[PDB]
PDB file of C-alpha atoms in Angstrom:
ATOM      1  CA  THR A1490      -0.014   0.008   0.004  1.00  0.00           C
ATOM      2  CA  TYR A1491       1.651   3.176  -1.290  1.00  0.00           C
ATOM      3  CA  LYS A1492       0.871   6.773  -2.172  1.00  0.00           C
ATOM      4  CA  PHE A1493       2.514   9.247  -4.529  1.00  0.00           C
ATOM      5  CA  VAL A1494       3.905  12.500  -3.110  1.00  0.00           C
ATOM      6  CA  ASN A1495       4.723  14.430  -6.297  1.00  0.00           C
ATOM      7  CA  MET A1496       2.441  13.092  -9.031  1.00  0.00           C
ATOM      8  CA  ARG A1497      -0.070  15.958  -9.449  1.00  0.00           C
ATOM      9  CA  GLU A1498      -0.838  17.937 -12.591  1.00  0.00           C
ATOM     10  CA  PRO A1499      -1.566  21.671 -12.558  1.00  0.00           C
ATOM     11  CA  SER A1500      -4.852  22.964 -13.946  1.00  0.00           C
ATOM     12  CA  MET A1501      -4.514  24.787 -17.266  1.00  0.00           C
ATOM     13  CA  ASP A1502      -7.652  26.938 -17.205  1.00  0.00           C
ATOM     14  CA  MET A1503      -7.335  30.696 -17.520  1.00  0.00           C
ATOM     15  CA  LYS A1504      -8.364  31.305 -13.907  1.00  0.00           C
ATOM     16  CA  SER A1505      -5.720  28.891 -12.607  1.00  0.00           C
ATOM     17  CA  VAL A1506      -3.111  30.395 -14.923  1.00  0.00           C
ATOM     18  CA  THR A1507      -3.913  33.909 -13.657  1.00  0.00           C
ATOM     19  CA  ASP A1508      -3.806  32.704 -10.044  1.00  0.00           C
ATOM     20  CA  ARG A1509      -0.392  31.161 -10.598  1.00  0.00           C
ATOM     21  CA  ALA A1510       0.810  34.346 -12.306  1.00  0.00           C
ATOM     22  CA  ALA A1511      -0.410  36.364  -9.275  1.00  0.00           C
ATOM     23  CA  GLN A1512       1.441  33.955  -6.998  1.00  0.00           C
ATOM     24  CA  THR A1513       4.586  34.391  -9.065  1.00  0.00           C
ATOM     25  CA  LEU A1514       4.417  38.179  -9.258  1.00  0.00           C
ATOM     26  CA  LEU A1515       2.980  39.098  -5.854  1.00  0.00           C
ATOM     27  CA  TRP A1516       4.677  36.454  -3.702  1.00  0.00           C
ATOM     28  CA  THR A1517       1.684  34.921  -1.944  1.00  0.00           C
ATOM     29  CA  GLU A1518       3.349  31.848  -0.434  1.00  0.00           C
ATOM     30  CA  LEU A1519       6.210  33.984   0.911  1.00  0.00           C
ATOM     31  CA  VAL A1520       3.669  36.102   2.738  1.00  0.00           C
ATOM     32  CA  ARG A1521       2.147  32.854   3.958  1.00  0.00           C
ATOM     33  CA  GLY A1522       5.499  31.881   5.566  1.00  0.00           C
ATOM     34  CA  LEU A1523       5.807  35.358   7.000  1.00  0.00           C
ATOM     35  CA  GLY A1524       2.351  34.916   8.517  1.00  0.00           C
ATOM     36  CA  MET A1525       3.422  31.623  10.109  1.00  0.00           C
ATOM     37  CA  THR A1526       6.428  33.271  11.749  1.00  0.00           C
ATOM     38  CA  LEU A1527       4.327  36.239  12.861  1.00  0.00           C
ATOM     39  CA  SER A1528       1.839  33.814  14.411  1.00  0.00           C
ATOM     40  CA  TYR A1529       4.661  32.137  16.324  1.00  0.00           C
ATOM     41  CA  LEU A1530       5.888  35.549  17.544  1.00  0.00           C
ATOM     42  CA  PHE A1531       2.693  36.077  19.555  1.00  0.00           C
ATOM     43  CA  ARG A1532       2.745  32.658  21.271  1.00  0.00           C
ATOM     44  CA  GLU A1533       4.120  31.973  24.746  1.00  0.00           C
ATOM     45  CA  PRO A1534       7.657  30.583  24.522  1.00  0.00           C
ATOM     46  CA  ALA A1535       8.459  27.118  25.835  1.00  0.00           C
ATOM     47  CA  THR A1536      11.512  28.264  27.834  1.00  0.00           C
ATOM     48  CA  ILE A1537      11.731  27.559  31.529  1.00  0.00           C
ATOM     49  CA  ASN A1538      13.568  29.702  34.093  1.00  0.00           C
ATOM     50  CA  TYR A1539      16.557  27.504  34.922  1.00  0.00           C
ATOM     51  CA  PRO A1540      17.918  27.119  37.572  1.00  0.00           C
ATOM     52  CA  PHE A1541      14.764  28.334  39.377  1.00  0.00           C
ATOM     53  CA  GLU A1542      12.632  25.946  37.343  1.00  0.00           C
ATOM     54  CA  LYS A1543      13.652  22.413  36.448  1.00  0.00           C
ATOM     55  CA  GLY A1544      12.773  19.956  33.688  1.00  0.00           C
ATOM     56  CA  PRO A1545      10.482  17.086  34.671  1.00  0.00           C
ATOM     57  CA  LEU A1546      12.068  13.774  35.582  1.00  0.00           C
ATOM     58  CA  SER A1547      10.948  10.297  36.556  1.00  0.00           C
ATOM     59  CA  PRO A1548      11.590   7.952  39.545  1.00  0.00           C
TER      60      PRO A1548
ATOM     61  CA  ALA B 738      -6.812 -11.163  46.115  1.00  0.00           C
ATOM     62  CA  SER B 739      -5.836  -8.057  44.150  1.00  0.00           C
ATOM     63  CA  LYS B 740      -6.775  -7.895  40.468  1.00  0.00           C
ATOM     64  CA  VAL B 741      -4.253  -7.056  37.776  1.00  0.00           C
ATOM     65  CA  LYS B 742      -3.607  -3.340  37.237  1.00  0.00           C
ATOM     66  CA  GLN B 743      -1.576  -2.369  34.201  1.00  0.00           C
ATOM     67  CA  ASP B 744      -1.157   0.551  31.837  1.00  0.00           C
ATOM     68  CA  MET B 745      -3.902  -0.036  29.256  1.00  0.00           C
ATOM     69  CA  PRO B 746      -5.979   2.054  26.867  1.00  0.00           C
ATOM     70  CA  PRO B 747      -9.308   3.245  28.284  1.00  0.00           C
ATOM     71  CA  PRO B 748     -12.357   0.989  27.701  1.00  0.00           C
ATOM     72  CA  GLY B 749     -13.532   1.478  24.151  1.00  0.00           C
ATOM     73  CA  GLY B 750     -10.483   3.301  22.831  1.00  0.00           C
ATOM     74  CA  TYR B 751      -8.655   6.573  22.431  1.00  0.00           C
ATOM     75  CA  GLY B 752     -10.095   9.438  20.415  1.00  0.00           C
ATOM     76  CA  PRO B 753      -9.138   9.730  16.747  1.00  0.00           C
ATOM     77  CA  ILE B 754      -5.745  11.215  15.878  1.00  0.00           C
ATOM     78  CA  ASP B 755      -5.378  13.439  12.800  1.00  0.00           C
ATOM     79  CA  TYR B 756      -2.499  12.744  10.428  1.00  0.00           C
ATOM     80  CA  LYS B 757      -3.484  14.031   6.960  1.00  0.00           C
ATOM     81  CA  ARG B 758      -1.966  17.242   5.582  1.00  0.00           C
ATOM     82  CA  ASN B 759      -4.041  20.334   6.395  1.00  0.00           C
ATOM     83  CA  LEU B 760      -3.008  23.263   4.162  1.00  0.00           C
ATOM     84  CA  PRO B 761      -6.025  25.528   3.515  1.00  0.00           C
ATOM     85  CA  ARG B 762      -6.351  27.910   0.578  1.00  0.00           C
ATOM     86  CA  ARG B 763      -6.663  31.215   2.523  1.00  0.00           C
ATOM     87  CA  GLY B 764      -6.339  33.658  -0.347  1.00  0.00           C
ATOM     88  CA  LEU B 765      -7.997  35.860  -2.943  1.00  0.00           C
ATOM     89  CA  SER B 766      -8.057  35.419  -6.737  1.00  0.00           C
ATOM     90  CA  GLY B 767      -5.382  36.758  -9.045  1.00  0.00           C
ATOM     91  CA  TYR B 768      -7.855  39.081 -10.821  1.00  0.00           C
ATOM     92  CA  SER B 769      -8.782  40.740  -7.540  1.00  0.00           C
ATOM     93  CA  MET B 770      -5.154  41.345  -6.505  1.00  0.00           C
ATOM     94  CA  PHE B 771      -4.292  42.754  -9.911  1.00  0.00           C
ATOM     95  CA  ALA B 772      -7.369  44.992  -9.850  1.00  0.00           C
ATOM     96  CA  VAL B 773      -6.466  46.431  -6.463  1.00  0.00           C
ATOM     97  CA  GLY B 774      -2.881  47.024  -7.563  1.00  0.00           C
ATOM     98  CA  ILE B 775      -3.876  48.879 -10.712  1.00  0.00           C
ATOM     99  CA  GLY B 776      -6.494  50.900  -8.825  1.00  0.00           C
ATOM    100  CA  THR B 777      -3.882  52.000  -6.279  1.00  0.00           C
ATOM    101  CA  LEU B 778      -1.524  52.912  -9.119  1.00  0.00           C
ATOM    102  CA  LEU B 779      -4.184  55.029 -10.869  1.00  0.00           C
ATOM    103  CA  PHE B 780      -5.086  56.870  -7.656  1.00  0.00           C
ATOM    104  CA  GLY B 781      -1.394  57.619  -7.008  1.00  0.00           C
ATOM    105  CA  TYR B 782      -0.891  58.852 -10.581  1.00  0.00           C
ATOM    106  CA  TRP B 783      -3.831  61.229 -10.244  1.00  0.00           C
ATOM    107  CA  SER B 784      -2.708  62.649  -6.900  1.00  0.00           C
ATOM    108  CA  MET B 785       0.882  63.128  -8.093  1.00  0.00           C
ATOM    109  CA  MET B 786      -0.338  64.784 -11.320  1.00  0.00           C
ATOM    110  CA  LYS B 787      -2.251  67.421  -9.350  1.00  0.00           C
ATOM    111  CA  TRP B 788       0.579  67.956  -6.891  1.00  0.00           C
ATOM    112  CA  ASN B 789       3.233  68.332  -9.610  1.00  0.00           C
ATOM    113  CA  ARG B 790       1.126  70.840 -11.558  1.00  0.00           C
ATOM    114  CA  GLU B 791       0.769  72.911  -8.375  1.00  0.00           C
ATOM    115  CA  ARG B 792       4.501  72.605  -7.819  1.00  0.00           C
ATOM    116  CA  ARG B 793       5.172  73.888 -11.352  1.00  0.00           C
ATOM    117  CA  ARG B 794       2.998  76.916 -10.663  1.00  0.00           C
ATOM    118  CA  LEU B 795       4.809  77.597  -7.378  1.00  0.00           C
ATOM    119  CA  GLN B 796       8.180  77.380  -9.110  1.00  0.00           C
ATOM    120  CA  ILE B 797       6.992  79.827 -11.769  1.00  0.00           C
ATOM    121  CA  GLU B 798       5.998  82.270  -8.998  1.00  0.00           C
ATOM    122  CA  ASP B 799       9.417  81.913  -7.344  1.00  0.00           C
ATOM    123  CA  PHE B 800      11.169  82.532 -10.667  1.00  0.00           C
ATOM    124  CA  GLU B 801       9.032  85.637 -11.218  1.00  0.00           C
ATOM    125  CA  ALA B 802      10.116  86.938  -7.802  1.00  0.00           C
ATOM    126  CA  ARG B 803      13.738  86.426  -8.811  1.00  0.00           C
ATOM    127  CA  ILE B 804      13.144  88.159 -12.155  1.00  0.00           C
ATOM    128  CA  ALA B 805      11.592  91.141 -10.420  1.00  0.00           C
ATOM    129  CA  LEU B 806      14.549  91.393  -8.031  1.00  0.00           C
ATOM    130  CA  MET B 807      17.303  90.894 -10.649  1.00  0.00           C
ATOM    131  CA  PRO B 808      17.882  94.495 -11.933  1.00  0.00           C
TER     132      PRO B 808
END
């Protein structure tokens, strides 16, 4: 049982062509990555205050 | 007579776990983006046209002041 990861064909209609041209010229996916980093900026960090706080351990 | 206690899944089972890729669209169309860009360009062109014509008139006035003072 297997699946393909890179076997998809782009749509060749005028709307899809114009959308791809807008992506190429206006950098939509780059803004998407910027949005991901901006979203992370507003989260609470995972850092603890060593040595005043310690990492969890087990018996 | 203690029964066996061991780390086991809860009766029934665990809740479903998502694993498939989740990448939404989250965007406009190309036509809309191009239309907004060209509209902004046209508005800017109009504003700068008026401002530069006014600036030309102001420069003419300054040059006339210089001409009146030259003799």
